[PDB]
Each structure stands twice: as structure tokens, then as C-alpha cells.
Design a protein around this motif. Structure first.
Motif: not given
Ligand SMILES: [Cl-]
Ligand SMILES: [Cl-]
Ligand SMILES: [Cl-]
Ligand SMILES: [Cl-]
Ligand SMILES: [Cl-]
Ligand SMILES: [Mn+2]
Ligand SMILES: [Mn+2]
Ligand SMILES: [Mn+2]
Ligand SMILES: [Mn+2]
Ligand SMILES: [Mn+2]
Ligand SMILES: [Mn+2]
Ligand SMILES: [Mn+2]
Ligand SMILES: [Mn+2]
Ligand SMILES: [Mn+2]
Ligand SMILES: [Mn+2]
Ligand SMILES: [Mn+2]
Ligand SMILES: [Mn+2]
Lengths: 98, 95, 106, 81, 103, 92, 99, 85
Positions: D68-78
Motif C-alpha cells: 500500500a505504502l509503495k503505491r502511495q509513493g511512500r516505500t518502507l524498508y524493514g
DNA sequence: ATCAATATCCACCTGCAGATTCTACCAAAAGTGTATTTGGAAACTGCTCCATCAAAAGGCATGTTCAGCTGAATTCAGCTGAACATGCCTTTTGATGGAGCAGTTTCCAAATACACTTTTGGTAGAATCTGCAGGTGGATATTGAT
DNA sequence: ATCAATATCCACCTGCAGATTCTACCAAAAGTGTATTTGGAAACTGCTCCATCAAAAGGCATGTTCAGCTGAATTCAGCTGAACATGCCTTTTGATGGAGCAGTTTCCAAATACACTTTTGGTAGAATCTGCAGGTGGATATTGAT
């Protein structure tokens, strides 16, 4: 009797929270909020502990970032106090409200 | 002598359905054609990824549908989801 | 005789061509029968939505041929299309007339 | 009696600001921040649940959130990115 | 194995399988998984070296996310590569706008 | 069900032989490789199409790299990439 | 005796005018030179499709007209009506171009 | 055989920079704006021409196509309709 | 800044629990060895589309004057937001069980991929058609001086 | 509250460049008929996840006092907008040579498809290590007062 002049503890806190990485919202109030919001999209949902943890990470990073641009905007208006007009202006230039 | 293909004739058909006495300039038609190609690609890619997250080899109309809900802002989504659901049942009820 | 799948689905947009573009586009190994139909529908719905709003823009400015200015007026003045295409540039589209209040005389 | 957005308190909202280098805070900031936070959460959760629903599940997974975060443009690592 | 043949720690064989099974194209050249594996390993080393330095600078011997964050943001180029990426548990760089300091 | 961990730790050990890595850090690194993997693969995927080719060759990978990586990181990546390919071909 | 509009009045006319139209606002040939100049300082012996130069201009003007909108908001935020380089810098620093 | 290109950024004139500000609804313009604007424009163009030319060369060509610019603009996150996009 | 007294901060050591490292083993990738395909790089070449050149003319860029009104600098009183101590209550967290349901497996029926084989729908120019761009000249509106 | 100087507007006109329609070939849908999977539907389990429970511990909510910051009010030098004269150079229109897309063919080097054969990378219990969190005890910073 003793007390620091206004602005001084504020700077101590800045140096403090910029040096650490702990989450800054209390876990449970946030968990309620997440579940509360989720329930409007599908009912009787369950969440991995990590799914709530990722969300919080995402939010606090986002908000901390938003306060950075907001603070820049207040300083641009020759102030040192962030105001909602600052947050609004930052969100329009980020294109979230454009 | 080589064969370029386009969504033009279909854009024009739909144009005629909606505004029967209105035309479209070639530059405007080009833009429309670029819009259909874009949206096709956005939906197909999201579909491609959904198919993967579920360990599936196939893109079903179901995948297209989730991709549509994800890509389109809410009221535009709902009408698109409906039109899609409708054209598919209409299709199956034939040979 | 042969009946096209588009007609079978009630669509102007070309179901057969959309099926071919899906297989040949490295999206997945195989492609289900309903997917090109459901997708052709969505494309046709959206096309229709923009062309209806653009046609009105042409008519509001007394022309009968839609040009890029008209596509732009339809897209920016409609909140949902605007967001869908919020990072898209429409060549020869111009901008919405909008002058900040603070800038006008007393 | 209480509301949940209000569970996002002033002390906490003050702390996030502080990490962002904010020195003085108008008292109106706090309700504004809860508004923004609620749009951020809604936008992401809505997409995440759409992943859940597509995966025929009744449980939001960390991957649903990451996607979700990726397609909102807020990619999360971890968390399994 | 192909990794050793290329001098690489990163798994050339696996990078190839992921390429085939990811629907990027019909066929995949023999060299592409090698060239890509090479590229992934380089970037990996670049970050681990800088993060290793961040660890050592704070008298620690185990790299944690704070060290990966200090490393990425303090480097202009990595910063740009991951400019729209959030590192869980990474924090932010110490930075206070001048006008906020006392007189 | 599988990860890039063991390679990351291998690479960690050549570079800082006495440095360890937390599990939460190891995830981040794994999410980083996966990310970049997908960026480069995708751009290469498109590059092959624009040229009407069926195959993704090391050429497509490198152009994709010049397009994705900031100017100094790009150059070094291109070097290492070319270096692993010739070294590989020159074996039997 | 001579006649003249008060300062600001023609500025407002020009805003209404250029917001009503869609023509390019930079001259065609000077822009083409700039492109050829920049391209060539990157690779020599390059040629350009006419539409490629037109695509570039379209993009550049859309980008600049968009940048001045955000700039203009920043000036107004500072209780000014005059855009200044510090406004553009603020606009670009949010927005992620200088972050 | 060729003519030498140089200083062409000055071909972006003050009149022209003023019109773009006006379409952006800008009323008053500080005198420092014009060179700042040239700075921002040149970076904007280098970045797009650099990527476009990377597409040209990968196609083993000597001619930048409108499509090269479109693909370039797309991965920059500035998608352009109207030229074969 | 000195003269002094609260608080904050930073260093060096230290003991411990929670993670990290080290060891001990099996399906499944990865590597090999054949036997076919097949993409696409090379090699002519038909033909758009680019670079260039010339030449005339007006739209527009340049450069100057001049004064209106804007940005910036100062001042200042009120009132907002910081600091701080108090008192209560929600959050943390620690185990304990229970069940909901993700994650695997095992089958077959339904659906999709092929391979050829007729059958149209679309595309590329030729042959027409028709909005609207560009130009007038006149009522209507806006702005700015007295 | 007016007229004068301009800008803006809306209609009516007319030939042309660009849109629409008309026709003739070929790439590509569609049609049938085998040859393969695969996505689900059912039955089970281990595992996280929810629900509680129960103290303690901070962390939050409240209220008081005052500092200092924000917003308002005035002032003024000088920057920037409007108007004007001059004339450069872009825009327009039109051809010409030839570079280089692009369209077709041809044919091995490279890739894919089996079939086995080996090796590695995951997973679940085994065994040291690194910081964390607390403790001083020594300077540091901050603020009030001769
Ligand atoms: Cl086995
Ligand atoms: Cl072939
Ligand atoms: Cl007139
Ligand atoms: Cl030639
Ligand atoms: Cl092993
Ligand atoms: Mn290769
Ligand atoms: Mn040069
Ligand atoms: Mn066994
Ligand atoms: Mn001149
Ligand atoms: Mn004066
Ligand atoms: Mn006077
Ligand atoms: Mn002022
Ligand atoms: Mn001044
Ligand atoms: Mn039940
Ligand atoms: Mn026909
Ligand atoms: Mn007209
Ligand atoms: Mn006071």
C-alpha cells in the motif's frame, strides 16, 4: 527557586528527539485508531503485529517530514511558530492538496 | 509502408455516442490515444503484481478489478467497476 | 457467421486487440478470457467520461471541434479526473483561469 | 467517554514536531495535525485492505501495508519490502 | 557455480531465475544476471561500508537501522537514490535551522 | 521461503570483517536489494520493448543502470557490472 | 494631457490574457538553440526530430508555469506580492527538487 | 563545417520569463527572478535531455525522437500527452 | 562577563538478558549434457525527414525615463504559548488459553495455450468537405483624472 | 458623482488547411479441435492474534505566571511597472542534397527445452556477546543577582 527561559527546553527536546529513533506516539491509542479506521472498509478484520508497526513507522516518518517543510514555511514568513497556514502551504506544494 | 495501430476509431465511436455533432482535432485525438495507452498500462501492471502476490500465473478479470479499485479515485472507480462487471457477464452469456 | 467479442460484451472498444496487448506485454504467463473484456470496458467508460466533459467545454466556448484546451478544462475542473491525471501534462492545454484574491485592487 | 483520534495527544504531537526541528507551536496545530494524520491513515489503510480482500484473507498483513505504502509513493524498508 | 565464475558473492543463478519468473521479457541473456548481480553487490557494499563507519563512530560494532540512516542521508548520492524511501527505526539527521538558536 | 541475507553478510564481512548486523538492519538491506532489483529489471523490461526485442541482455541492464543511478554511483556500478561479465565469459 | 494605467493594472490584464490562451510563450528558434547547445555538451553529432524539440518546449513551459504558481503562493505567504528567488528556492525545496 | 553554440540560455528573454510568470498568475516580479529562472530551466532541460539521449543511444540511433523525450519525461515523473505518448 | 547555585550532560565502569553466532541436517534450486529452435545482428537499400540556405518583413525584444506604491525597517502593547509543579489514570506488559484462519496439500473439472485455417476489421493513402482563424468595424465595459 | 482614453467583446464574413469520408489490400481476429494446467474447493493443523487480567509506572491533563513573539501601524528610499522609440532577428515560405530511419532477408550464435545429478540455502534447536540501562562523580550550561 529556578526556571529556564521560554525556548530553552524546546531546544533541548529538539536535540533529544533528533538523536533517537523511538516511536513518539503511544502504541495502544494508535492501534485503536488504526482498527477504528479499518473497520469502515471491511469489518471483523485482524492485524499482524508487524502490520500495525509498519503503519506507525510510516505515519511518524511522514509527520516528522511534514513538520520539516512546515517549519521552513513559518521561517519564510519571518516567524518561529508553526501555524496551520504553514501546514496547508506545505501540503499544497507537495501536491497533496494542490 | 508499415502498420501503425491506434485506439482512434474507437475513441471516435464513443465520441459520436456522447456528443453526436462534435468533432475532435487530431492533436486532441492524439492526447486521448495517449490517455488510453497510459491507463491500460497502469491497470495491467498493478494486475500483473496482484497475480504475483497470490502465486498465480493468470490475470483474471478479478485481478483487473482489484487493480481498478486501487488506481481510480472513488466515484470514478465505482462506475468503472460496474461497467466492467456488466460487460463480462454479458460476454459469458454467449458463444 | 463470426461474432466479435466486443459485440458480445456490448463494447465499442476492441476486446480482441486488448487481449493481444495483455499476452504480449509481459504482464503474466497466461491471460483469462474475462480480463480483456473487463479492461476494455473500463477504458471505454473513462474515455466516455472525458469526452462528455470535453464536449461541454467545446460548446461552452462555441466550437464544435474538441481541441486540447477543452481536454484540459474538463480534466482540471473535475476533481476526480484531475487527481487521476494530476501528474500528467497535456500539450497545448494551458491553465485554469485563477487569480489569487490578495492580488486584486480595492 | 473519549474519541480515538484524540488519543493522538498533544504531548505526542509536540514530540513529532520536535524531531522535525520545530521550536514554537501555535495551539491550533494540534487539531490540524490530527486531520492530516487521519487522511494519511485512511488513504493507506484503504489500499492495504484492498490487498487483504484480494488475497481472500481476514487479516491485514505487514506486506499488505508495505504494498500500500509503495503505491502511495511512500516505500518502507524493514517489514518485508 | 556462476557466481564464483564472475567473482561474485551475490547469487547469479538466483538472479537469473527471478528474472525469468518475473515477466520482464520472454528470454534472458546469459550475461544479464551476472551484470545485475554485480550491480546489486556493489551498491550493497557501498552502503555497508558507510554504515560500518557510522557504527564505529558511535562506539558500536553492530550496524543497526540508525546507522543505515546516518549513512544514506549524509551521502548526497545514496540520498538521491533512496530519496523517497523510509527506513524503519532510522530516525532523522540532527539539524536545527539557524534562526532558532538563542542570541 | 527465501532471502538475500547470506550474501549481504558475506559482503559485510569482506568490507567490515569485525562488524555485525542487527536483524532489523538485515531486513532493510534485503528490502533495499529487492527494491533496486525491481527498479533495474523493470526499466530494462521497458527498454527491451521500445527496441522490439524479446531478450533482456546485459546491454539493457546497463542502460537501465545509467538511467536509474546518480552520476557517480552509476559509473562504478557500470564498471563492476562489465567486470563480472568479461570475467565470467572468460571461463570454462 | 497624457494617460497611463496605475502600476499593477496591466500586470492583471496580462494574467487574464495568458491564462486564457495556450500558445507557447518562449520563442521557437531561441529555444531550439538552447536544446542543441545542451544536448551537444553531452553527446556530439546528435540530430533532432522537430516534434522532439516541440515536446521538450511543451514540457519545459508546463514545468515553469507550474513552478511560478507554487512560487507565487510562497510570496503571498510572506505577505508580499512580489516573487523573489528565495520563494522559488522554498518551492523547489519542498516539492523534493532540493530537499 | 559547423557554427558554434554558446550563451543560448540568454535566448530565454525577460519578456518570455514574464509571460510564463503571468500564466502562473504572478503579478509583481523581483529583478533577481530572471537569472534564477534561467538556472532552474537549464537544470530542468539537462536532466531531460540526458535521459532522452540515453534512450537514443540504446536504440543505436543518431536522432533523438519525440518518443525518446516522452519516455525520458515519463521516468522523471512528468508524463506528457500529445506526441505519441 | 564574574559571582553563585540549580540542573543538565558526559564519561568510565559494570552486570545481564535478549538477541546473534555457531552446529547439525534435507527438498529444491543450480549446474550439466544434449537436441532444437529462433531471435536479431549483419547486410543491401528504398525513401522520409533533417539540416541548411535564402530572402523579405513585421512582431517583439531592448533600452531609457520617470514616479507609484511596495518591501523593509522600526516600534510597541497585548496576548499567546512555554515552563513547571501537581494529581490522577491510561498505557504497558506479562502470562494463560482458546480459537480463528493463514499456509499447505490433494484432487479433478474448467479454462487457457496451441496449431492451422477461413474470414473480417483497420489502416493507409486518395478524394472530398467544412469548422474556424484572422480581419473588420461597432456597442459595451473598465479604469483613472478632476 | 462624471466624462475621456482605452481595452475588451460579440457578430458577421470567407477561403483553407486540416478533418472526414471513400476504397483497396493484409495483418490479425475468429472458428474448431486437441493438449495442458491451474485455480479453487475441501479438510486439517500449528501459530499468531484477540481477549482479559493486574498491578505499577510513568506519562498526561490541569492551571498559574510571565516572557517574548507576533501582528499592527507608520515611514520612506528606491525598485519595479507602464509607456515609448528603434530596429534586430525571429518567423514564414520554399526548395535541395543526402543522412539515416526503417523495411526486408538471411542465417548462426545464443537461448530454451528436457533429463538427471549435486549442492546449497532454510529451518529448528545449540552457545557466546553486545549493549542497555544504572551508577557515580566531574565539568558544563543556564539564569539570577554585587
Ligand atoms: Cl525428497
Ligand atoms: Cl524468426
Ligand atoms: Cl477593432
Ligand atoms: Cl547513407
Ligand atoms: Cl551449505
Ligand atoms: Mn546477455
Ligand atoms: Mn558546447
Ligand atoms: Mn529427512
Ligand atoms: Mn533594438
Ligand atoms: Mn519617489
Ligand atoms: Mn505629481
Ligand atoms: Mn507594504
Ligand atoms: Mn527599502
Ligand atoms: Mn464460530
Ligand atoms: Mn470490412
Ligand atoms: Mn476570431
Ligand atoms: Mn510585557
Amino acid at each position: 527557586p529556578h526556571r529556564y527561559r521560554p525556548g530553552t527546553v524546546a531546544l533541548r527536546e529538539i536535540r533529544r528527539y533528533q538523536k533517537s529513533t523511538e516511536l513518539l506516539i503511544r502504541k495502544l491509542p494508535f492501534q485503536r485508531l488504526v482498527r477504528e479506521i479499518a473497520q469502515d472498509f471491511k469489518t471483523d478484520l485482524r492485524f499482524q503485529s508487524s502490520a500495525v508497526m509498519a503503519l506507525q513507522e510510516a505515519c511518524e516518518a511522514y509527520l516528522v517530514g511534514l513538520f520539516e517543510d512546515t517549519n521552513l514555511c513559518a521561517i519564510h514568513a519571518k516567524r518561529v511558530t508553526i501555524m496551520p497556514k504553514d501546514i496547508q502551504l506545505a501540503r499544497r506544494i507537495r501536491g497533496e492538496r494542490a | 509502408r508499415t502498420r501503425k495501430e491506434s485506439y482512434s476509431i474507437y475513441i471516435y465511436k464513443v465520441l459520436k455516442q456522447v456528443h453526436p455533432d462534435t468533432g475532435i482535432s487530431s492533436k486532441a485525438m492524439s492526447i486521448m490515444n495517449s490517455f488510453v495507452t497510459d491507463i491500460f498500462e497502469r491497470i495491467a501492471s498493478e494486475a500483473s503484481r496482484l497475480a504475483h502476490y497470490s502465486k498465480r500465473s493468470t490475470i483474471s478479470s478479478r485481478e483487473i478489478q482489484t487493480a481498478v479499485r486501487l488506481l481510480l479515485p472513488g466515484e470514478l472507480a465505482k462506475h468503472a467497476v460496474s461497467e466492467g462487471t456488466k460487460a463480462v457477464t454479458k460476454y459469458t452469456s454467449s458463444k | 457467421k463470426a461474432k466479435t467479442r466486443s459485440s458480445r460484451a456490448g463494447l465499442q472498444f476492441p476486446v480482441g486487440r486488448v487481449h493481444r496487448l495483455l499476452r504480449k506485454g509481459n504482464y503474466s504467463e497466461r491471460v483469462g478470457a474475462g480480463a480483456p473484456v473487463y479492461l476494455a470496458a473500463v477504458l471505454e467508460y473513462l474515455t466516455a467520461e472525458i469526452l462528455e466533459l470535453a464536449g461541454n467545454a467545446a460548446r461552452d466556448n462555441k466550437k464544435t471541434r474538441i481541441i486540447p484546451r477543452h481536454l484540459q478544462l474538463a480534466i482540471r475542473n473535475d476533481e476526480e479526473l484531475n487527481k487521476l491525471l494530476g501528474k500528467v501534462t497535456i500539450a497545448q492545454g494551458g491553465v485554469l483561469p485563477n487569480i489569487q484574491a490578495v492580488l486584486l485592487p480595492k | 467517554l473519549r474519541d480515538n483520534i484524540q488519543g493522538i495527544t498533544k504531548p505526542a504531537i509536540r514530540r513529532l514536531a520536535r524531531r522535525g526541528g520545530v521550536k514554537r507551536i501555535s495551539g491550533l496545530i494540534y487539531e490540524e495535525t490530527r486531520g492530516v494524520l487521519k487522511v494519511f491513515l485512511e488513504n493507506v489503510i484503504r489500499d492495504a485492505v484492498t490487498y487483504t480482500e484480494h488475497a481472500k484473507r481476514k487479516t491485514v498483513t505487514a506486506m499488505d501495508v508495505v504494498y500500500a505504502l509503495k503505491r502511495q509513493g511512500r516505500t518502507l524498508y524493514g517489514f518485508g519490502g
